[PDB]
Amino acid sequence: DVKDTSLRVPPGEGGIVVRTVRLRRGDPGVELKPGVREVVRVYVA
Amino acid sequence: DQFRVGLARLARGVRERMLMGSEDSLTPAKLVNSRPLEAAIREFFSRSQ
Amino acid sequence: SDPVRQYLHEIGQVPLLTLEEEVELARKVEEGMEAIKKLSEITGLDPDLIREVVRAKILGSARVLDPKTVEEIDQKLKSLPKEHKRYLHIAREGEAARQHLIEANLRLVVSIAKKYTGRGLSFLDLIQEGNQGLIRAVEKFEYKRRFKFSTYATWWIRQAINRAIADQARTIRIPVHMVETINKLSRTARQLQQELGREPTYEEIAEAMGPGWDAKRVEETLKIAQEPVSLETPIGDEKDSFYGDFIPDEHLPSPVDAA
Amino acid sequence: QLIHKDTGLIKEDEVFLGHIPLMTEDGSFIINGADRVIVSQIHRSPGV
DNA sequence: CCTGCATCCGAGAGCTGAGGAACCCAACCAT
DNA sequence: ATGGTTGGGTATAATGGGAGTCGTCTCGGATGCAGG
Numbered sequence A: 001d002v003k004d005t006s007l008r009v010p011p012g013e014g015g016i017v018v019r020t021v022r023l024r025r026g027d028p029g030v031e032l033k034p035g036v037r038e039v040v041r042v043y044v045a
Numbered sequence B: 001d002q003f004r005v006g007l008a009r010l011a012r013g014v015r016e017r018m019l020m021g022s023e024d025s026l027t028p029a030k031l032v033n034s035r036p037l038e039a040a041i042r043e044f045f046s047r048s049q
Numbered sequence C: 001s002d003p004v005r006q007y008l009h010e011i012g013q014v015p016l017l018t019l020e021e022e023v024e025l026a027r028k029v030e031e032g033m034e035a036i037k038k039l040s041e042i043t044g045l046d047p048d049l050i051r052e053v054v055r056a057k058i059l060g061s062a063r064v065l066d067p068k069t070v071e072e073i074d075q076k077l078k079s080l081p082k083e084h085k086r087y088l089h090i091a092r093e094g095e096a097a098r099q100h101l102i103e104a105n106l107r108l109v110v111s112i113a114k115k116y117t118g119r120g121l122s123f124l125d126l127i128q129e130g131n132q133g134l135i136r137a138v139e140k141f142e143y144k145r146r147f148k149f150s151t152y153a154t155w156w157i158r159q160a161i162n163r164a165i166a167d168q169a170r171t172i173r174i175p176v177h178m179v180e181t182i183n184k185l186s187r188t189a190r191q192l193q194q195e196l197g198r199e200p201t202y203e204e205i206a207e208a209m210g211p212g213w214d215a216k217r218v219e220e221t222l223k224i225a226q227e228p229v230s231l232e233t234p235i236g237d238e239k240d241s242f243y244g245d246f247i248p249d250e251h252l253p254s255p256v257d258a259a
Numbered sequence D: 001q002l003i004h005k006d007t008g009l010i011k012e013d014e015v016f017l018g019h020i021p022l023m024t025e026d027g028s029f030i031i032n033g034a035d036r037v038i039v040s041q042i043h044r045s046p047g048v
Numbered sequence E: 001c002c003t004g005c006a007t008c009c010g011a012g013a014g015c016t017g018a019g020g021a022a023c024c025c026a027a028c029c030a031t
Numbered sequence F: 001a002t003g004g005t006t007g008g009g010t011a012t013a014a015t016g017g018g019a020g021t022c023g024t025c026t027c028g029g030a031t032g033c034a035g036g
Helices: B001-022 B035-047 C004-014 C019-041 C049-057 C069-076 C084-112 C123-140 C149-168 C177-194 C201-210 C214-222
Strands: A017-024 A038-044 D029-031 D034-036
Touching: B001 B035, B035 D029, C004 C069, C004 C084, C004 C123, C019 C049, C019 C069, C019 C084, C049 C069, C049 C084, C084 C123, C123 C149, C149 C177, C177 C201, C177 C214, C201 C214
Parallel strands: none
Antiparallel strands: A017 A038, D029 D034
């Protein structure tokens, strides 16, 4: 009873993944908007 | 200028707290409410053209 | 234009009261209510219906139950031999006194309501809700206790204004108790920030609130307290882009799905 | 400092007024994690 | 009585692309 | 049958607001006032 909502590369983009950042609730200095559990960022070169 | 606008709002709040409150037991920390000053500074640095 | 100055002018066009007039009017209202209940017992009808018809006759033809039935009952009241038309007279006098008392005390409402601006209700809405509270206070006042009318009326005016603010300030209605919970949470967080030198965390707010409060409950309460944003919020320096221009529709099937 | 007009009692306290953004070495600001510049404005000078 | 002439108000001002502040108590319907 | 939500009440006395906006240029009509 789950469905795909994954993040994908938009048309005309791409490259090499150089970095990833994961911010979770409770980490020092992290201010996530209410309701958000975690944030994942990917840097592609 | 934005700091002055926020400080004026804070002064208005402090005056209302002075008038509504009791003069017998009062300390500066209870009267001063810094929410308008922070609001003004955020407004300037986030939404000013 | 500027309806605030207009209303203030209409308000100041009525003179204030002295203690003699105020106590006289309050006594007249009380005797009018007693006369109304005595008349209801004599005629056997409901106190509410008789009060409504007497008020209709006092206010006159200007204020638009129908003329047939009110005239019928008003003539039935004229059918009383004696010592009962007297009760009718005191009822009418008490209703006139009620009107005069409300009109004279309308200025206290404005004085009280001027301190609740900037909380999601405009000044004139606050004034009107304060007027409703004032009418309540006139209804419930008791002059025997030798208390000035403003002392009792201020409580009811404040109650009306606060209930109106908690009822009509948000696009999504939130129950009154949980509005008080939100306000208490905001006050607690503000004092915690003042003492801590930085924004508190959810755990500290939960600890400061007391028993039965944890970080998840604080998070949910802060989540529901978010106000909706405008679909017409401008985006960019030019007046050509709005917020709602970026929000797609997910309900209607796409051509691909239909095919 | 809170002073009584008639009594003359004095109560002094240090109040936390909030935060003020700091300008970096090169002359920009970090607002919500983004780099920003405040642009100078030109306007009619006050006077007669 | 007529006429013209200051005065005031309201509606205009190119296209495309990108951009983000009281509290308490008591009862009553919903589920 | 339990929280969730709604209504009523608080009694010294209190009785007319506040942010603001001044760097547009034109045009066409509606309108009130000057003259004869």
